[PDB]
Design a protein around this ligand. Structure first.
Ligand SMILES: [Mn+2]
Ligand SMILES: [Mn+2]
Ligand SMILES: [Mn+2]
Ligand SMILES: [Mn+2]
Lengths: 423, 423
């Protein structure tokens, strides 16, 4: 049957993972690859070439989401879509995102080798960017596909990066958003344009590995939020300004970072997380008392209300700390505060059937990380396939998924796409 | 007499202060000017031009200390020296250091207009750098003039900046070519090679302004130290690594910064200070748990033993925090731990006499900031002349000393140089 016929070029896929990792601003084994930079442009060209070699019809939208379609026997029907991202945060790994892009192309090649003939077309999406590194905006491509007018407006009017380069200027340097007449609504997909959307991804947790399982059938994605906070004080000379006269913006930031941890732990649930991954001091000189501090805070929970309580407490603490330290709370901005997504029950059923037919052990589980799937779920029924990764490591160069684990994920993706194409 | 004949071009000196401030990597009103950068080179050239216009013999040593001599009637006698620095930490003011360099040149011009005939030569020193910004080393020039073999060795073997540029490469780019035969010992001054060393400097405190006084006669300089600390943890995914499994290097850093403040306050003396002016996270992404943190800590006291107790407590806390957070204390480096210095009693005497002869009010006081004077004191009798500054502000663009305050300092410097030259 179809399932028994599926065969993946596992070393070939690994070779592509390694080749793509060369497009990096960080030295190997780390990867850094940021939206619209030269390394991103090179990586896009590499992927588009692989899509062409796979016989896919390739197109791009106004912000650089890339689509590669295998036309079905009934091409007017909403297609079955799959895909992921290839951007990488600073000093991260080679597998996050990339497995779901290169692996989706491999799933096409696998199905073609088996002589599968899709009824509904299959389409691979390379999302233009999923990581928030450049503009503070996660899932930039999929948020637009899912029809965010607010985001489209912001991208055209106010959005800039840390070097004051605008979104539009960055896009144009990479070959996109050239048309002046587009408010970016051209990117929006109407609800139902895809029959379903699937994303293959490394688990980014140790559960499948610890339990000895091959496949996670993802049932939900946890609710993510992020915040930016700034404090301002008077600054001055570190040697000469006596302690009673200070209002140290760095100490306010230190206290807020510890308050974030405290409020997360106060939830009493191990599913709650919060992190201060960015903490910058100005002027940032050893002998200058910080007059401005800038924090960026990530916080999430599978339970939206429980997460929101953490956010409320963080704002309360920022105000309490500012008053105590006698500094100005000059910025407190919630950058995003998004609900969780639920995978579609029929997609879940088909995925689990596919794993069973392939003799692959599996469990149903939640995603802690967010993904493009979070926003694609607003447009069509969604599911995700998790594969194991070594010790759950992710967002660091120790991240690793074996050729066998990737091949298993590709087989499940191939078979689930096939099932949905004939639905 | 000589005193009554001294006249300063006060607006002209102000104009020079303003012109020099244009050599900056920060937009006005702030100044940033770092050792061996293009802005530093431009400022060196500006000063050397003024020295030549004042008829001084101009020379430079291996690391770029600049000397401008007015030859006396007895040129073989140890000269009377004066000088300061022109480097500026990020986003600082226009007066720190610069007043004692431009003001020293103006003092020469003042004495020449009055027809003064020196016995001992007078020599102006532009120290190559006094701020620790680039290499973490304060008083780089004067520590070398004072004969630090440990520093000379480090500069040629291990010292690099934050961008991994070596001291040698940086010096070379600024026109200080490396002599592989020179271990920098060529820079060392013989003890007693100067009769005395004087530094004119803004107070960097509010005392003279608050008390309505013209001149501070500095009697001692507080004991400065600095520390570099790094913590290392596992890092990883901000969304997926659950709180009990973390070893967050950023939170270790936050706790250490708060411990620094605590230990300073524990001294029970208002003269004790400590600051964390630099706190950097790696990888520094919103969704990546910090795997490395880097702190640079400044701590000082007029009392050396009290200062040292603070340092010991900070090291104890760094170890306690590392154990509790389950991170590695990967670096704990005391970069410098220097004793205080006392001004020479006969230099103090001459300075007070000069202020009195000029009908300027004055008081004895200590310096909280460190200065090149701290290390020149190891080579020759030392003193400092403080002038008032607005609200004591320093290391920020609000720093200000009036044209009159500078001119009065210049007059005291001129007259003190003259008195010492004839002694
Ligand atoms: Mn990621
Ligand atoms: Mn991802
Ligand atoms: Mn300074
Ligand atoms: Mn200074």
């Amino acid at each position: 049957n179809l399932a028994s016929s599926l065969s993946v070029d596992a070393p070939g896929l690994q070779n592509q993972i390694d080749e793509l990792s060369s497009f990096s601003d960080a030295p190997s084994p780390s990867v850094t690859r940021v939206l619209y930079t030269d390394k991103d442009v090179s990586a896009r060209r590499y992927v588009k070439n692989l899509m062409a070699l796979a016989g896919l019809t390739v197109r791009e939208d106004a912000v650089g989401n890339i689509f590669g379609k295998w036309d079905g026997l009934e091409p007017n029907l909403p297609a079955v879509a799959t895909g992921s991202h290839i951007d990488a945060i600073p000093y991260s790994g080679k597998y996050d995102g990339v497995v779901g892009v290169l692996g989706a192309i491999e799933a096409i090649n696998v199905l073609k080798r088996s002589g599968f003939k899709p009824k509904r077309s299959l389409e691979i999406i390379l999302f233009t960017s999923e990581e928030p590194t450049r503009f503070g905006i996660s899932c930039l491509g999929s948020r637009l596909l899912a029809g965010s007018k607010e985001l489209a407006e912001a991208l055209k009017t106010t959005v800039v990066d840390g070097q004051n380069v605008s979104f539009i200027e960055a896009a144009r340097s990479a070959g996109y958003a050239e048309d002046k007449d587009d408010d970016l609504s051209s990117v929006f997909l109407k609800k139902g344009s895809y029959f379903a959307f699937l994303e293959l991804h490394i688990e980014q947790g140790p559960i499948l590995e610890d339990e000895g399982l091959d496949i996670g059938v993802v049932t939900a994605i946890a609710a993510p939020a992020s915040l930016k906070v700034e404090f301002e004080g008077n600054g001055g000379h570190a040697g000469a300004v006596l302690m009673p006269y200070r209002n140290d913006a760095g100490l306010a930031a230190a206290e807020l970072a510890l308050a974030v941890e405290k409020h997360v732990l106060e939830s009493e649930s191990i599913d709650t997380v919060g992190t201060v991954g960015i903490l910058e001091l100005h002027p940032g000189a050893i002998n200058s008392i910080p007059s401005k501090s800038h924090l960026e805070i990530d916080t999430r929970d599978i339970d939206e209300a429980r997460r929101n309580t953490v956010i409320k407490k963080i704002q309360e603490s920022a105000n309490t700390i500012a008053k105590k330290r006698k500094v100005k709370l000059s910025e407190f901005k919630i950058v995003n505060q998004d609900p969780p997504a639920l995978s579609d029950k029929l997609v879940i059923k088909k995925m689990a059937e596919a794993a069973t037919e392939l003799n692959l052990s599996h469990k149903m589980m939640i995603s802690r990380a967010y993904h493009d799937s979070l926003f694609m779920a607003r447009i069509s029924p969604m599911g995700m396939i998790f594969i194991p990764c070594y010790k759950g490591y992710s967002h660091k160069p120790e991240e690793y998924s074996s050729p066998e684990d990737m091949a298993n994920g590709v087989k499940v993706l191939s078979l689930t796409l096939a099932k949905l194409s004939l639905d």
